[PDB]
């Protein structure tokens, strides 16, 4: 197991994790927008 | 300071930052769930 294999596997883990953190943010941004609409309605 | 040293240090920064962004998300997901419970209770 070379240094480049370690770097590649770290980069791959990071990219997979970044996509998951983005998905979680989008879910939470929808939830916050729903609360904001509830507190803002007439 | 070689190119590989730069790549390694970038990867290490990114992995540390990813763990912190995850912790912040978990804190905020608990806060949003608490608000959702407050707006949903009988």
């Amino acid at each position: 197991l070379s240094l480049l294999d370690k770097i590649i596997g770290a980069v791959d883990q990071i990219q997979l994790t970044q996509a998951q953190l983005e998905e979680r943010q989008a879910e939470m941004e929808g939830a916050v927008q729903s609360i904001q609409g509830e507190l803002s309605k007439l | 300071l070689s190119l590989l040293d730069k790549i390694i240090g970038a990867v290490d920064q990114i992995q540390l930052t990813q763990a912190q962004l995850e912790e912040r998300q978990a804190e905020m997901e608990g806060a949003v769930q608490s608000i959702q419970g407050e707006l949903s209770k009988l």
Epitope: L1, A10, Q20 | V11
Partner: nanobody
Amino acid sequence: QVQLQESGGGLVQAGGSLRLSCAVSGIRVNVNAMYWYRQAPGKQRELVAIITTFGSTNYADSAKGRFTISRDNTKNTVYLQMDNLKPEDTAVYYCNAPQFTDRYWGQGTQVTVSS
């Protein structure tokens, strides 16, 4: 699949020490950042410690210098040494990699600290 087999918990007195182990299969611990979490009854899962691919560490504030994460690359195993334990550390402890936390959790290892 990824396998996570946690061990080393038990019943310990306050001020005591434990060393948790997580034996990993299906990913390499010297390639992937690895995390320890804990979950107390009825509470949200808390990140405790992280070790990066190239061996940097960070800890939750609740560890406050008491915990040490490490790994053995040959045994593909991650460790959490926990010193000066307190009742507030009672929880089930879990190891995972960040890319799988949405997907799978092992059974964990129960830690109970009594005064």
